[PDB]
């Protein structure tokens, strides 16, 4: 269809390599010494590879386009475009065959497996150190027997001739070219029928899986030995000059010369009938030269160049972090792009950024050329190009009209999730930094102590619309990992709003009666009334409630002057009970939540801007600062510490009379100091929090307006321990191993640490800083694995019709709730009805639970529901909207085309840097690691017994034999406990031992539901301890990619217990339901992978070769002659076409409607 539909990878026959080429290169001559012209038959010739200048031959006889298809006679060169030097190969006619290093040393060896001889013996015959009998002949010998070149004369007075034996690569090529594949299948399927699968019936199983692979495709096995070499086009191993008469040549020309110069040498050595003892030494050298050209390091040591650095082969220009896949195909430096430092710019609207004139004039330069040459300023683009560099006056307003409604995207350094790119509307500023709205900073994770940002310009109307509709910063109001807002005011917007909404009891103007916001404003602007004075205000406003109805709020409320000054920004729909409180950080986020849920999108992005302005203004007018007397040190500290010291002295007094050993110098002194640390941290908050006034006999404690206290209690910035170290005592420190240093820092940062106290606190500081940078690699690796396992999961249909799910409950600790069923069932749709204990049902199956339906779950005493999970969706190569649930960032149900896989992968990974003591546990969960000494389950039921000869193989007697006969026996080590007592009646899934929980002994013995429950509570108990909140519907769209291959039980067209991808098992077991009748469809068992095995076992070689292990993947793909239906997200970015998600689906869908309407 007008463009390729698949990419296939084959093995190249010598007959087809000679078809790629355009001539043979014979001499290792690159370029001419003095003139800069290619040689005659060298690595760079022009008759082979093509002309150097466009449309002219080398000597210059035909220099024109008037000669399109001319070949010259003075020079064999062609008159054609010089771009063909990028495409046009030649070859190297080897005189000795040489094996392909990949098909020998890729572990396993597709060559040591065809013949069934260990590679330790193939490597002797291939590098000339032993013999093989290609044919034992009528002589008695064996076939694949290693004759020592000395033992090659075993009976040369009686054996002689009439049989063949050799060494090198023609030996192996003759062993391959004549080997009966059908016959080895014959006498190999007769060797696997035995069902004796102990030790040999596994090594004999792989050999025929390989031998049937060659019968199927057409690749002869003798093609794994090259009789001709191809050479890369010359413009891909270039010969750019250097500064001062030199050449920074490639390593691909070094390794080509090292091969031509041994080919020619061995050829003219063959011509002379030189001795065999040196011709063999040559042949072994020709082979190692080709193995280095293909990749050095596999077998050779370090074949090395001028600068003592090993040369770079062909199998290094496609593999690893700096190969082609990464660094060039998922990479791509781009045009229309820039950078700068970011500043704060707090007078912007949430949809705007400040863009310098100097940057914006470069980025938008062709747009400006066109708008000049349009509105009659320059005629041809040269004068316009000229007035752009002189920076005229008519240019700076054209630039203002061109970038008017043209958005730009801004990105930060590690794009940890999708909020790291947002689109903005630029307004030309002057200066050289970028201004960034204060509320989009916690998304980007930016602050203004040095960070930079990149600016990209969308060029097309489908990308300009995609910038506004999808990425623009006004749509990204809530997190995609939770539902929580991301535009919540943060640090000194929180402090202003917290300050003005507190209240002071006896204040100036207390009890007055106002009727408006204009009233309180006018009376405040006069200096006659406080901002913390209690007043009475009259309100009259409409308030939408949960059901959606709209009642009327009226009356006269008791307020504070400061709260009532915020009443101007509240929109209609929200009740004044939201503002009528002290407005800590939590409550401001709640205001923004309600504004979004009840009023929608722009109402919220207007309320947020106004809260920003008010906080910025009233933290200023407050003149809030920090001095050194805000850090108030309690008055009991010295007595507390002296009593701790006297107790320490008594503990060591005990120890000196030998009444305790480890306690009397540890675990007791450390507990004294750990208790005194917190008594002093408690005394310090009874001094920074309380206050005192006694004016009118008013002697009592009031809440303080201390500046250090108000910064913490506001939730704006600061903790209780950070405040405990400034004015309490720093307590116990850690040596890096983890133990506690017995002598505590009894001083805070206000009085100052001594030098022997400041020393012991540097161990912890260095340990923390060292962890911090030796950990982002651990988390970036996990994130990349997760994005490669789950990438191609997309929501592709509205419903799949399934009716199965999972039983959700409250995730208790075994002591208390720790999470309710509500907040766990919100957004998840029902799979079963939810009938109550009396008998009547509340909610039918198929209802998207939302906030207006989960109160019925808690008000009616329900505690276990069955939700439509995505581990149990019935969609093939995708998900459905009703099994996913809510969008978590739109607070709706998902749309068709929404890529849940990437979103799910960069929501478990983004908080990776926040948990390490931890991240190894989520690694050992998502990698399905069968733990050390896990347990032993119960395969069959019956009664329990045992039996053993103390041979460390204690067997099982689970045969009850009371209903008849039974065969239920096991084994184990003799030094472990069997959790089942001497007798019991234990069915499938019971534990006959104790230890870890193997995730594979949960999948075949207990089914999919116990496994899902296990991994789901386990992955969340690790994120919740650090206070990270991820929706568990994100962990479930990843477990779906760990259960995607099954081990076969029956058979309709495939082999036995060989694995298989479910979407293959399921499509044929649906032809048989049509083809014959049900034809014994196929029955199978689900098995469990890791996120790396699942991603390497993909059905795409282009997508698994991009991931890792590129050679181990490409050799297999080329032997099996695999085909890649593109079909995927990553596969579609390498070849540059629309991914099948988002707007790439909808353009197909919305275009299916047109050909229908034209019919």
């Amino acid at each position: 269809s007008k463009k390729f539909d698949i990419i296939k990878i084959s093995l190249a026959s010598p007959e087809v390599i000679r078809s790629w080429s355009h001539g043979e290169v014979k001499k290792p001559e690159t370029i001419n010494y003095r003139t800069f012209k290619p040689e005659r038959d060298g690595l760079f010739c022009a008759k082979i590879f093509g002309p150097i200048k466009d449309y002219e031959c080398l000597c210059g006889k035909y220099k024109r386009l008037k000669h399109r298809g001319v070949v010259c006679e003075r020079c064999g060169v062609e008159v054609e475009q010089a771009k063909v030097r990028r495409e046009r190969m030649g070859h190297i006619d080897l005189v000795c065959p040489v094996v392909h290093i990949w098909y020998l040393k890729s572990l396993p060896s597709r060559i040591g497996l065809f013949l069934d001889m260990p590679l330790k013996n193939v490597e002797k015959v291939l590098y000339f150190e032993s013999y093989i009998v290609t044919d034992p002949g009528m002589t008695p010998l064996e076939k694949k027997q290693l004759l020592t070149d000395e033992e090659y004369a075993e009976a040369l007075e009686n054996y002689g001739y009439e049989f063949e034996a050799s060494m090198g690569a023609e030996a192996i090529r003759d062993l391959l070219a004549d080997t009966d594949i059908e016959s080895e299948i014959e006498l190999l399927q007769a060797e696997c029928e035995e069902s004796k699968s102990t030790a040999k019936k596994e090594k004999a199983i792989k050999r025929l899986r390989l031998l049937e692979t060659f019968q199927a495709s057409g690749n002869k096995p003798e093609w794994m030995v090259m009789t001709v070499l191809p050479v890369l086009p010359p413009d891909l191993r270039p010969l750019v000059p250097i500064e001062g008469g030199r050449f920074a040549t490639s390593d691909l020309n070094d390794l080509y010369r090292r091969v031509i110069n041994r080919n020619n040498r061995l050829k003219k050595l063959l011509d002379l009938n030189a001795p065999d003892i040196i011709v063999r030494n040559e042949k072994r050298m020709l082979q190692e030269a080709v193995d280095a050209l293909l990749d050095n390091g596999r077998r050779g040591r370090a074949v090395t160049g001028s600068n003592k650095r090993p040369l770079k082969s062909l199998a290094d220009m496609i593999k690893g972090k700096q190969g082609r896949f990464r660094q060039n195909l998922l990479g791509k430096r781009v045009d229309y792009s820039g950078r700068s430092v970011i500043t704060v710019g707090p007078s912007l609207r949430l949809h705007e950024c400040g863009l310098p004139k100097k940057m914006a004039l470069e980025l938008f330069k062709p747009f400006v050329y066109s708008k000049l040459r349009l509105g009659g300023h320059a005629t041809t683009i040269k004068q316009a190009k000229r007035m752009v560099e002189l920076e005229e006056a008519v240019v700076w307003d054209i630039l203002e009209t061109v970038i008017n409604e043209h958005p730009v995207l801004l990105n930060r350094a590690p794009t940890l999730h999708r909020l790291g790119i947002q689109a903005f509307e630029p307004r030309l500023i002057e200066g050289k930094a970028i201004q960034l709205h204060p509320l989009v900073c916690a998304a980007f994770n930016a602050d203004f102590d040095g960070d930079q940002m990149a600016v990209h310009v969308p060029l097309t109307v489908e990308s300009q619309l995609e910038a506004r509709v999808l990425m623009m910063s006004t749509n990204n109001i809530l997190s995609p990992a939770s539902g929580q807002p991301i535009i919540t005011p943060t640090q000194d917007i929180v402090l202003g709003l917290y300050y003005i909404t507190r209240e002071k009891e006896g204040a100036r103007g207390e009890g007055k009666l106002f009727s408006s916001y204009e009233d309180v404003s006018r009376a405040y602007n006069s200096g006659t009334i406080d901002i913390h004075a209690k007043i009475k205000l009259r309100i009259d406003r409409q308030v939408f409630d949960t059901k959606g109805n709209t009642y009327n709020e009226k009356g006269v409320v008791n307020t504070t002057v400061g709260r009532a000054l915020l009443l101007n920004i509240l929109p209609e729909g929200l009740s004044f009970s939201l503002l009528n409180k002290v407005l800590v950080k939590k409550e401001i986020s709640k205001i923004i939540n309600q504004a979004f849920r009840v009023l929608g999108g722009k109402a919220t992005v207007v309320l947020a801007d106004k809260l920003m302005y008010a906080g910025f203004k009233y933290s200023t007018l407050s003149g809030v600062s920090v001095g050194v007397d805000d850090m108030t040190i309690p008055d009991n500290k010295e007595a507390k510490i002296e009593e701790a010291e006297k107790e320490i002295k008594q503990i060591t007094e005990q120890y000196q009379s030998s009444l305790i050993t480890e306690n009397e110098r540890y675990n007791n002194i450390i507990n004294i100091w750990s208790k005194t640390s917190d008594e002093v941290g408690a005394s310090m908050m009874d001094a920074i929090s309380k206050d005192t006034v006694s004016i009118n006999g008013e002697k009592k404690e009031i809440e303080s307006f201390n500046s250090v206290y108000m910064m913490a209690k506001s939730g704006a910035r600061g903790s209780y321990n950070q405040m405990r170290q400034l004015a309490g005592m720093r307590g116990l420190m850690a040596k890096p191993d983890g133990t506690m240093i017995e002598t505590a820092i009894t001083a805070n940062f206000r009085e100052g640490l001594s030098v022997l106290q400041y020393f012991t606190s540097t161990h912890g500081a260095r340990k923390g800083l060292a962890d911090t940078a030796l950990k982002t690699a651990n988390a970036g690796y996990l994130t990349r694995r997760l994005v490669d396992v789950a990438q191609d999961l997309v929501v592709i249909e509205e419903d799949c019709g399934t009716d199965d799910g999972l039983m959700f409950s409250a995730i208790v600790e075994d002591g208390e709730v720790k999470v309710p069923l509500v907040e766990r069932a919100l957004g998840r749709t029902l799979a079963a009805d939810v009938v109550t204990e009396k008998g009547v049902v509340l909610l039918e199956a198929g209802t998207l639970l939302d906030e207006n339906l989960v109160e019925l779950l808690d008000d009616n005493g329900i505690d276990m529901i069955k939700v439509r999970s995505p581990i149990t969706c019935k969609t093939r190569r995708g998900l459905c909207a009703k099994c996913y649930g809510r969008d978590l960032a739109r607070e709706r149900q998902v749309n068709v085309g929404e890529s849940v896989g990437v979103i799910a992968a960069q929501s478990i990974g983004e908080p990776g840097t926040q948990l390490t003591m931890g991240l190894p546990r989520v690694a050992e969960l998502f990698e399905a690691r069968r733990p050390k000494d896990a347990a032993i389950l119960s395969p069959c039921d019956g009664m329990v017994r045992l039996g053993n000869r103390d041979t460390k193989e204690k067997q099982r007697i689970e045969i009850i034999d009371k209903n008849g006969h039974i065969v239920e026996e096991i084994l184990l080590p003799k030094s472990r406990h069997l959790v089942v007592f001497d007798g019991e009646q234990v069915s499938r899934g019971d534990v006959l031992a104790d230890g870890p929980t193997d995730p594979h002994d949960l999948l075949k013995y207990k089914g999919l539901e116990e496994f899902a429950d296990y991994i789901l509570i386990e992955a969340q108990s690790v994120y919740r301890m650090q206070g990270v909140v991820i929706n568990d519907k994100h962990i479930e769209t990843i477990v779906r990619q760990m259960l995607r291959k099954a081990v076969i039980l029956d058979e309709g067209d495939s082999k036995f217990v060989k694995d298989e991808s479910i979407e293959l098992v399921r499509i044929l077991e649906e032809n048989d339901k049509l083809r014959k009748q049900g034809k014994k469809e196929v029955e199978y068992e689900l098995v469990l992978m890791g996120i790396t095995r699942s991603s390497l076992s993909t059905e795409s070689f282009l997508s698994a070769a991009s991931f890792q292990e590129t050679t181990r993947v490409l050799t297999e793909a080329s032997i099996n002659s695999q085909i890649d239906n593109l079909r995927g997200l990553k596969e579609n970015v390498l070849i540059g076409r629309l991914i099948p998600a988002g707007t790439g689906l909808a353009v197909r869908k919305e275009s299916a409607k047109i050909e229908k309407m034209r019919e």
């Binding site: 609207r349 949809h351 708008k371 349009l374 509105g375 009209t401 008017n404 409604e405 043209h406 509307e425 109307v461 489908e462 300009q464 619309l465 995609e466 506004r468 509709v469 999808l470 623009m472 006004t474 749509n475 929608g600 999108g601 722009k602 749309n895 068709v896 085309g897 988002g1142 707007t1143 689906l1145 909808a1146 353009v1147 919305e1150 409607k1153 047109i1154 309407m1157 034209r1158």
Partner: protein
């Protein structure tokens, strides 16, 4: 984000992806009609927002008419 709201258009279209597809078709038909080069350099708007606004006003086009086969 001055006076064309994406919430105003999500009352007519679906998925926020259909909106992009349809708006781009509308904009391409506007741009392949002239819309500039003669007398209205700094007197008009961008075809992107002109097309995005006719969906939010039930204006010159609705989703079914946006085709023009």
């Amino acid at each position: 984000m001055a006076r064309v709201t994406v919430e105003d258009c999500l009352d007519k279209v679906e998925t926020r992806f259909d909106l992009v597809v349809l708006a781009s078709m509308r904009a391409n038909k506007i741009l392949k009609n002239g819309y500039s080069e003669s007398m209205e350099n700094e007197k008009k708007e961008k075809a992107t927002v002109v097309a995005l606004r006719e969906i939010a006003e039930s204006e010159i086009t609705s989703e079914q008419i946006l085709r023009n086969e």
